[PDB]
Amino acid sequence: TTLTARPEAITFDPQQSALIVVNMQNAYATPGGYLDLAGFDVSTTRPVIANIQTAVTAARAAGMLIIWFQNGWDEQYVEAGGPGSPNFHKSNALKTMRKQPQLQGKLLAKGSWDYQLVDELVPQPGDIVLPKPRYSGFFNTPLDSILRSRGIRHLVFTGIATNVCVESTLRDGFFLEYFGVVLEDATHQAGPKFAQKAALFNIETFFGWVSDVETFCDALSP
Amino acid sequence: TTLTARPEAITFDPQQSALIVVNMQNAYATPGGYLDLAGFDVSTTRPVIANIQTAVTAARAAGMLIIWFQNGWDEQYVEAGGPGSPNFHKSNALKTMRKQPQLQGKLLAKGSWDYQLVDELVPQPGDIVLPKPRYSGFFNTPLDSILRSRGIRHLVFTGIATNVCVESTLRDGFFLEYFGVVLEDATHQAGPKFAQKAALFNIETFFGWVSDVETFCDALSP
Numbered sequence: 001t002t003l004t005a006r007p008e009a010i011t012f013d014p015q016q017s018a019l020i021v022v023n024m025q026n027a028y029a030t031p032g033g034y035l036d037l038a039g040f041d042v043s044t045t046r047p048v049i050a051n052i053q054t055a056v057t058a059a060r061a062a063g064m065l066i067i068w069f070q071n072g073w074d075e076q077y078v079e080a081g082g083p084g085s086p087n088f089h090k091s092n093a094l095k096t097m098r099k100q101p102q103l104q105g106k107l108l109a110k111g112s113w114d115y116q117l118v119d120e121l122v123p124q125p126g127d128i129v130l131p132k133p134r135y136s137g138f139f140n141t142p143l144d145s146i147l148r149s150r151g152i153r154h155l156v157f158t159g160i161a162t163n164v165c166v167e168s169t170l171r172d173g174f175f176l177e178y179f180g181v182v183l184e185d186a187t188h189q190a191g192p193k194f195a196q197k198a199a200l201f202n203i204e205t206f207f208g209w210v211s212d213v214e215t216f217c218d219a220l221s222p
Numbered sequence: 223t224t225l226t227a228r229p230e231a232i233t234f235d236p237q238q239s240a241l242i243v244v245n246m247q248n249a250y251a252t253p254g255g256y257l258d259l260a261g262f263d264v265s266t267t268r269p270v271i272a273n274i275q276t277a278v279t280a281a282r283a284a285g286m287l288i289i290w291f292q293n294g295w296d297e298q299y300v301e302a303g304g305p306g307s308p309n310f311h312k313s314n315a316l317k318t319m320r321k322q323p324q325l326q327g328k329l330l331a332k333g334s335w336d337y338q339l340v341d342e343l344v345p346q347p348g349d350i351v352l353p354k355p356r357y358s359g360f361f362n363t364p365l366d367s368i369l370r371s372r373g374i375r376h377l378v379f380t381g382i383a384t385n386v387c388v389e390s391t392l393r394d395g396f397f398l399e400y401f402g403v404v405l406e407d408a409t410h411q412a413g414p415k416f417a418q419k420a421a422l423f424n425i426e427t428f429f430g431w432v433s434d435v436e437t438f439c440d441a442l443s444p
Contacts, residue, residue, distance in 0.1 A: 010311075084399075086400065086402070086429075087396070087399075089401075090430070135393075135429075136394075136397050139397040139398075163424055171357075171393065172358075174309070174312070175358055175361040175390075177306075178308065179311075191423055191424075191427065192423075194420060195420055195424070197416060201417065202386070206357065206385075207308075207312060
């Protein structure tokens with residue numbers, strides 16, 4: 001199969017690929033969730049949700065493994081690392097709860113509303129739902145063992161944030177010799193608009209390929 | 223010690239920290255080297271070389287370990303991976319040498335000028351010179367082993383490019399629980415201006431801290 005992409009088309013087998021949906025939780029796409037409370041812009045994720053819905057529908061009907069990532073931790077944040085971890089000092093959710101104790105133990109807390117997958121996106125039997133404790137899905141998880149168990153060597157990325165969890169996971173997969181593609185209209189960045197453009201440029205130029213949902217489904221149609 | 227930085231200052235012990243000089247080879251910083259040949263603007267790297275030497279002097283005087291990265295491979299590029307590796311398809315050196323066969327074996331190749339550390343930056347006994355096969359210094363190398371073996375938990379980054387090998391290595395350091403700092407004026411991006419700004423933003427916002435050489439040296443003086 002050929003997927004049209006920048007900087008050039010690639011060939012791949014959908015039965016030996018995975019559609020990875022990164023962090024499509026209320027924290028990352030819903031007004032009132034973590035990213036919004038922490039000052040990031042979330043007002044435009046409605047098309048992103050729908051675009052992933054279309055892509056998931058196309059990927060499952062082609063025999064592609066769907067992996068859903070849920071980022072976050074136990075509600076006491078033992079899994080976020082204590083003061084000894086950079087993630088304690090960097091996490092903008094932790095920072096946000098330190099400034100607003102009313103939200104303590106709610107942001108990115110397993111079991112909470114912030115943690116839930118957004119209503120529109122409902123995994124189905126045979127999908128994999130993966131929790132992860134840091135930005136990249138390859139560190140501290142069985143993701144790599146899962147893909148190699150199935151001979152998967154091509155990865156298609158969707159989700160949020162383009163420049164944070166999507167890019168780091170794609171970057172790390174490249175280092176583990178995976179071929180990674182991002183569908184640009186099924187992502188949203190965390191930061192200013194230039195953060196979207198910059199993460200796409202890094203991927204296309206150095207680490208993977210950039211395509212789009214419409215092209216993706218059209219490539220899967222046969 | 224305290225180091226002033228964005229988004230806030232951090233504390234660290236120089237004797238339990240490393241300064242990392244990423245890829246300060248002719249390929250990345252010299253006219254007529256790899257990046258230049260591939261169409262990246264390399265005309266403004268001269269101040270980067272001067273600011274790194276300033277940083278190296280201060281760091282060694284403080285007991286901080288110096289690590290030099292040299293990116294590249296055997297002249298046959300066996301180590302860059304064959305066509306089954308995404309590095310074969312994404313390496314812009316490999317791409318450039320496939321468009322200008324006269325350069326085959328010349329870019330990023332062990333024993334070649336392109337691969338040599340620039341004339342201005344001379345590793346001293348006591349430093350570690352580390353070869354790496356891929357963008358991130360933390361894959362396929364003993365870098366992590368080396369830092370752990372010394373109780374090293376803080377990393378100060380300099381080098382080229384800010385968005386590629388520098389940021390990749392800092393990001394993976396973060397997933398390995400390293401506190402990573404980048405000195406913004408001792409780095410230079412591969413790509414347009416947003417590539418520098420975005421790399422600084424992503425580090426400062428999600429992965430680490432941003433300072434500069436003047437600050438860094440002042441912090442080490444006592």
